[PDB]
Design a protein around this ligand. Structure first.
Ligand SMILES: *[C@@H]1O[C@H](CO)[C@@H](O[C@@H]2O[C@H](CO)[C@@H](O[C@@H]3O[C@H](CO[C@H]4O[C@H](CO[C@H]5O[C@H](CO)[C@@H](O)[C@H](O)[C@@H]5O)[C@@H](O)[C@H](O[C@H]5O[C@H](CO)[C@@H](O)[C@H](O)[C@@H]5O)[C@@H]4O)[C@@H](O)[C@H](O[C@H]4O[C@H](CO)[C@@H](O)[C@H](O)[C@@H]4O[C@H]4O[C@H](CO)[C@@H](O)[C@H](O)[C@@H]4O[C@H]4O[C@H](CO)[C@@H](O)[C@H](O)[C@@H]4O)[C@@H]3O)[C@H](O)[C@H]2NC(C)=O)[C@H](O)[C@H]1NC(C)=O
Ligand SMILES: *[C@@H]1O[C@H](CO)[C@@H](O[C@@H]2O[C@H](CO)[C@@H](O[C@@H]3O[C@H](CO[C@H]4O[C@H](CO[C@H]5O[C@H](CO)[C@@H](O)[C@H](O)[C@@H]5O)[C@@H](O)[C@H](O[C@H]5O[C@H](CO)[C@@H](O)[C@H](O)[C@@H]5O)[C@@H]4O)[C@@H](O)[C@H](O[C@H]4O[C@H](CO)[C@@H](O)[C@H](O)[C@@H]4O[C@H]4O[C@H](CO)[C@@H](O)[C@H](O)[C@@H]4O)[C@@H]3O)[C@H](O)[C@H]2NC(C)=O)[C@H](O)[C@H]1NC(C)=O
Lengths: 59, 204, 48
């Protein structure tokens, strides 16, 4: 299982930041885990961003 | 979550770092080496993951969660964060605890404070820089004061870095206006290392 | 209200409603089918 991040390393202010993760060795369809992001500002603590999953319920 | 800022220990000794604010059992701890990605060393309190030594053990008593590392070694030197689920599905992280297993010997820091230059004030800018170096462990908090009252504005502090002599070094940058610089005579910079503090002061 | 013999308690009483009553019945278990092979030619669907 390997996670490879890709996207612009330099973005201008007020613009739209876009990043894409490429998974290897596992399927995103799998209902065993959620997929998301966690950002860590330089010399600072870990902050949770968010996660989602298509594995749904009846509603 | 409230995690202690620092932690130290000798090789072979056992360190116990705590965490509070956890009312549930979803508590988990992480290990992040400097210049690397974080790695999960524990989950669901006590339970261990694959390829993780037995010497790592999670524990939670009341509202307090605790991690315990016995038989310290070189590779255990890193920053340790704790995290847990709260409420419905949100998750938060602590400030993290920096644990260092560096070699001997301990030493007091060294502070050199430089007031703004003559050419800098002409650019209508004022910046004071505290240079701290040759200290153990590698985690130090820095404080600023203008005359007697403390300065809460313009403080930029960065994580220390190891030198060629294996001693850590850090620099804090205070950027203010030339008006408040000339008004207040002396500017004090307080550097707190393992309880004891080292102070420097400059006046024009 | 309909019954074959009313005063008789041995006979069931059939009732017909005016307004329909909303009822929900669900299977709050999201399942999968094993579809195991018990051949030749036959395949049984087990509950995963
Ligand atoms: C209960 O549990 C089950 C699991 O046990 C849950 O089931 C899962 O539900 C999710 C959500 O629907 C599914 O994801 C969808 O995937 C389909 C494609 O599915 C096919 O491909 C899958 C991947 O196959 C690959 O990987 C596997 C594994 O590695 C590999 O083996 C395989 O060879 C291949 O390499 C297959 O897994 C999948 O199989 C499933 O179905 C089989 C029958 O077909 C069944 O036999 C299997 O057992 C298995 O169950 C299948 O072959 C995506 O197309 C789909 O994306 C659309 O749908 C979701 C909502 O469902 C929506 O949010 C998306 O946005 C997207 O909708 C847009 O695209 C549609 C066309 O693609 C279009 O029709 C829509 O109108 C919509 O388009 C509009 O919006 C977009 C923006 O959104 C816009 O751009 C357009 O222009 C337009 O405006 C889903 O992502 C899982 O596949 C499914 N199964 C599993 C195992 O996870 C279930 O959810 C749980 N809950 C309930 C209540 O049942
Ligand atoms: C659909 O369901 C309904 C109910 O859900 C079914 O209704 C049931 O129908 C049967 C009939 O098969 C009834 O049984 C019959 O009852 C009659 C009448 O009995 C009552 O009145 C008697 C007299 O009452 C008057 O007199 C007194 C005295 O002056 C006054 O005070 C009163 O006010 C009246 O004016 C009285 O004697 C009865 O009391 C006795 O019986 C009851 C019930 O068992 C007991 O609790 C009492 O303690 C007391 O013992 C009663 O109050 C009876 O006359 C019928 O008896 C005939 O049939 C018997 C077999 O069951 C048989 O052994 C008897 O000998 C008698 O047969 C006689 O009469 C025939 C006809 O003339 C003759 O051919 C025969 O040769 C013989 O001479 C019988 O017991 C049920 O009561 C009734 N259910 C209820 C709850 O009331 C219906 O059948 C179902 N139908 C279908 C298609 O599904």
């Amino acid at each position: 299982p390997q996670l490879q991040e890709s996207g612009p390393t330099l973005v201008e202010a007020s613009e739209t930041l876009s990043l894409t993760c490429a998974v290897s060795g596992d399927s995103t369809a799998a209902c065993n885990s959620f997929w998301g992001w966690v950002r860590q500002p330089p010399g600072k603590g870990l902050e949770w961003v968010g996660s989602l999953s298509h594995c749904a319920s009846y509603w | 979550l409230t995690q202690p800022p620092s932690a130290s220990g000798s090789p072979g000794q056992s360190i116990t770092i705590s965490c509070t604010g956890t009312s549930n059992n979803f508590v988990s701890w992480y290990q992040q080496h400097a210049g690397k990605a974080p790695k999960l060393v524990i989950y669901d309190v006590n339970k261990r993951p694959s390829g993780v030594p037995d010497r790592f053990s999670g524990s939670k008593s009341g509202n307090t969660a605790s991690l315990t590392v016995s038989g310290l070694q070189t590779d255990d030197e890193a920053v340790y964060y704790c995290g847990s689920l709260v409420g419905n599905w949100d998750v938060i992280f602590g400030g993290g605890t920096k644990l260092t297993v560096l070699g001997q010997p301990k030493a007091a820091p060294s502070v050199t404070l430089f007031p703004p230059s003559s050419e800098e004030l002409q650019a209508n800018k004022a910046t004071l820089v505290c240079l701290i170096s040759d200290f153990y462990p590698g985690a130090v908090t820095v404080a600023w004061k203008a005359d007697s009252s403390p300065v809460k504005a313009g403080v930029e502090t960065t994580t220390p870095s190891k030198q060629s002599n294996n001693k850590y070094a850090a620099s804090s940058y205070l950027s203010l206006t030339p008006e408040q610089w000339k008004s207040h005579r002396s500017y004090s910079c307080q550097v707190t290392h393992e309880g004891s503090t080292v102070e420097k002061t400059v006046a024009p | 209200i309909r019954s074959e013999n009313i005063t008789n308690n041995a006979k069931n009483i059939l009732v017909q409603f005016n307004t329909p009553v909303q009822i929900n019945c669900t299977r709050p278990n999201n399942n999968t089918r094993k579809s195991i092979r018990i051949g030749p030619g036959q395949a049984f669907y087990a509950t995963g």
